[PDB]
């Protein structure tokens, strides 16, 4: 019985609403269709570095994220590319908060302070072989949802 499709539905509700411009939606759809195969081939840690490097984790975008974890009325603002990459980062972190892989207080307390995003990535590193196995179906679900509910350019 498959609750990763359920968790995927919740995360997709959140991000689909948190993107105003339609181009941001479509960019997210492309990230969804691509980064799952990437995370399968290359692995989790390389792909994570890729995403977070194309996400523009300032204290503004990270604020929009930290609120998105609870808001239902938050908004991801920025360029289509930055916001698509941050939305996928939220997808991943949202999986990690549920499924108890990362303590939510730790994830928040690290997203706030820059001196702890490195420790976030260090924990992510220690756990990578677990995450890379668990998150596969979650990400395939997000892929299917994206290519269903969003259109193409």
């Amino acid at each position: 019985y498959e609750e990763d499709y359920k968790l995927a539905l919740e995360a997709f509700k959140k991000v689909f609403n948190a993107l105003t411009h339609y181009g941001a939606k479509q960019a997210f759809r492309s990230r969804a269709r691509d980064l799952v195969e990437e995370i399968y081939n290359s692995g989790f840690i390389p792909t994570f570095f890729y995403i977070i490097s194309k996400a523009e984790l300032n204290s503004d975008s990270l604020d929009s994220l930290i609120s998105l974890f609870s808001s239902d009325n938050a908004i991801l603002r920025g360029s289509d590319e930055n916001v698509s990459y941050s939305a996928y980062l939220f997808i991943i972190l949202y999986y990690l908060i549920k499924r108890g892989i990362i303590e939510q207080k730790f994830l928040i307390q690290a997203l706030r302070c820059e001196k702890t995003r490195l420790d976030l990535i260090d924990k992510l590193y220690n756990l990578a072989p677990i995450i890379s196995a668990k998150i596969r179906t979650y990400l395939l679900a997000i892929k299917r949802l994206s290519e269903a509910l969003i259109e193409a350019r």
Binding site: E103, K105, F106, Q109, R112, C113, E114, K115, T116
Partner: protein, 173 residues
């Protein structure tokens, strides 16, 4: 009623006699079982004030103080300066959270007014210079934990756990 008291872990020995109670209740949230120190509560936003060490109220999320949790109410020379507070047992930023709690708890905090005549420009400080590790082990880590040196032979673990687990932020003042 279940009610604990949080004692932070700075590098100063200004923590000697600041309580009137050692065990208080039945369980110490902070556990030490063959893996080091556990359930260690992280309290953010508050920097340490080694000059009469207390948690100053800072607004920056990067600043924080770490310490352990034990039961009781300290030294009965208080109730004007401390942050008592009643928490629902899961709003605590514990690390390596071992077990669950009873849906609520009420703990205490060494609290301070910010004395806004000097800029609190904090600085992080870690626990090195093992002499302090040893004198706090003999000082605080046994006066409340005599379990150590009775059963635990791997004191070195909870020894080396002092260096690795406790960063915090001094006001520099």
């Amino acid at each position: 009623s279940t009610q604990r008291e949080y004692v932070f872990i700075p590098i100063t020995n200004s923590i000697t006699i600041d309580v009137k109670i050692t065990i208080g209740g039945s369980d110490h949230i902070t556990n030490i079982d063959e893996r080091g120190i556990h359930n260690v509560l992280v309290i953010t936003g508050y920097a340490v004030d080694e000059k009469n060490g207390r948690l100053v109220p800072t607004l920056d999320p990067c600043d924080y103080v770490k310490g352990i949790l034990v039961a009781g109410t300290p030294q009965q020379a208080q109730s004007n300066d401390f942050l008592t507070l009643k928490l629902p047992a899961n709003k605590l930023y514990l690390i390596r959270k071992k077990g669950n709690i009873s849906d609520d708890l009420k703990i205490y905090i060494p609290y301070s007014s910010p004395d806004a005549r000097n800029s609190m420009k904090t600085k992080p400080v870690s626990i090195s210079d093992d002499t302090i590790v040893n004198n706090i082990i003999k000082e605080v880590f046994d006066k409340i934990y005599n379990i150590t040196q009775k059963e635990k032979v791997k004191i070195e673990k909870v020894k080396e756990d002092i260096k690795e687990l406790f960063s915090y932020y001094a006001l520099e003042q």
